[model samples]
Target: GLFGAIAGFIEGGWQGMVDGWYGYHHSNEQGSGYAADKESTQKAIDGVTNKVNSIIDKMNTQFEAVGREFNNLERRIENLNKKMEDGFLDVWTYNAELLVLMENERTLDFHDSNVKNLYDKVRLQLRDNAKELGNGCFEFYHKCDNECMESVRNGTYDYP
Candidate 1:
């Protein structure tokens, strides 16, 4: 009878061991699957971050190129005084400065950073000259010159 009881206990212990092994195996499989998913997610995140950084680098390069172009434009205008007529130069200079001012408005107004004061100086000079020119033209054309003027009202200025 004692031998039979020992046999029954050994059989029960082996069955319990098998059940524990299967439970541990199932837990390991689940853990491994979760790890794989986490790794894949992390890799995807890294790839997206790299792409964003690359785009930012390209944008910075393009902005620098545009800045150089604007500098060249400013220099060209400065040298224009030598070659351009006073009236045309005044117009072009004011327009150029106005463009620059409008473009850099965020920096000048919000940031309080006067990034382009040189342009302002040119604009002021151009403005003074424009005022003088305007006054002169108004004084000169105060009276309509029908002698040299073509009357578009009667289709006199239409191209032949």
Candidate 2:
């Protein structure tokens, strides 16, 4: 009994093993052969089944671990995106206030008595700290100042 059943299980897998056991039952029903080793045959099949179940359990555990790590990665990406947005906002807010200051200034003559000394100080500070701020802020400040300086040369530096 074990010989046929094990051979069938090896050749055709679990379905073949079931067919082999069914053949044995049919033979016993027809009074063709004695069924004396049923207990040992059942024990062998149960052993193989338990081993397969244990392997499946191990695979399921690995999949769950992968899923948890994926969720953690997703959270980290979200936090990184938020940090980038906040940095952009810091640069943006500073540029907006600087634009207001630029709009109100009447002159950029560094040595002129009527010009605000605070304007020279703020402009110099921005130039020195451009790299510490974001690149977009630096480029914006540089371009806008270039245009305003041209306007001052043309006697038209009146608005932002």
Candidate 3:
């Protein structure tokens, strides 16, 4: 398929270019006449096979990397939460880590309802904890909670 793309682009006409741009391949009958040379076509196919494989792997690598990154972040936050719940150190000490996570988490590209909801559950819990401690948590929690309602209406909460 990728081989054909290369051939079409290399051999297509103005009409071919237009059709190809719109996702139709070039036809030899219409385009600047392209003779099917066994030597060249075979060589192109042979050459492009490796290139196509690399392209496929590159895309797979990128997608895998993204998924792994998200999963790792989730795992780390879960670990941190568990640690906080277990009464390791002072609970408020997690404020530093939680705030850092919130800042870094904004870089996430996938923000469907599940992620948002998880975030809210965690934030609301922290908000409660903050109410006990009485510090900067209220301001950020207040702002984020307000945005949560706004995001709910905006259809980011689910596949509206």
| lDDT (Cα, tens digit) per residue for candidate 1, span 17-55 | 322111101112123111112332354446546655754
Candidate 1 error regions (>4 Å): 1-36, 63-160
Tell me the RMSD of model 2 versus the true structure. 44.3
The candidate scoring highest on lDDT is: 2
Compared with the true structure, model 2 gives a TM-score of: 0.22
The better candidate by TM-score, 2 or 3, is 2
* lDDT at residue 29 of model 3 (Cα atoms): 26
User: For this target, which candidate reaches the highest TM-score against the unseen true structure?
Assistant: 2
Clashing pairs in 2: none
**TM-scores of all candidate predictions against the true structure:** 0.20, 0.22, 0.20
**How far out, in Å, is residue 5 in model 3?**
16
Error of 3 at 59 (Å): 3.5
Q: Write the per-residue lDDT of candidate 2 for residues 4-50, one digit (tens) a residue.
A: 22222223323323323321111212233312224334554575476
Candidate 3 lDDT, 73-115, residue by residue in tens: 4987766665555553444346545654754443221222222
Cα error, residue 93 of model 3, in Å, equals 35
Clashes of 3: 0
Give the CA lDDT, 0 to 100, for residue 99 in model 3. Answer: 50
How far in Å is the alpha carbon of 80 misplaced in model 1? 12
